[PDB]
Design a protein around this ligand. Structure first.
Ligand SMILES: C[C@H]1Nc2c(cccc2C(=O)NCC(F)(F)CN2CCCc3ccccc32)NC1=O
Length: 113
């Protein structure tokens, strides 16, 4: 897939996540465990992922095919469901993002083939 085609098709699905307030706020930047006072984060989360990293990968042509993008979004979600307790804002915000993403990504992936 050409990188410009992936950007054009997939960026709106990422924008849909960014638009969610308050739910996207913990996901907009890479987790900094010491700054956030969660120093065990990388012990539990082996492959961190966040919206800004995903955007950078689209912008710099790092995805060869669209399932790699879907996999990074899902990695971000699974990290949050793994690390955080079920009562936490991050956990519940993650669940909302996953609802939004599911709706956005469906027709786009059908269109890309
Ligand atoms: C992905 C990673 N995020 C954090 C996790 C735990 C603790 C903090 C974060 C985090 O990102 N802090 C930065 C923030 F900007 F989000 C601050 N702030 C904005 C308003 C809404 C809100 C809600 C909950 C926590 C903080 C927060 N667990 C995780 O799995």
């Amino acid at each position: 897939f050409k990188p410009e085609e992936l950007r054009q098709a997939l960026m709106p699905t990422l924008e849909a996540l960014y638009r969610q307030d308050p739910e996207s706020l913990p996901f907009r930047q890479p987790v900094d465990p010491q700054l956030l006072g969660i120093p065990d984060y990388f012990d539990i989360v082996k492959n961190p992922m966040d919206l800004s990293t995903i955007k950078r990968k689209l912008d710099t042509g790092q995805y060869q095919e669209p399932w790699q993008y879907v996999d990074d979004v899902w990695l971000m979600f699974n990290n949050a469901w793994l690390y955080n307790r079920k009562t936490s804002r991050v956990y519940k915000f993650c669940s909302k993002l996953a609802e939004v993403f599911e709706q956005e990504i469906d027709p786009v992936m059908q269109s890309l083939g």
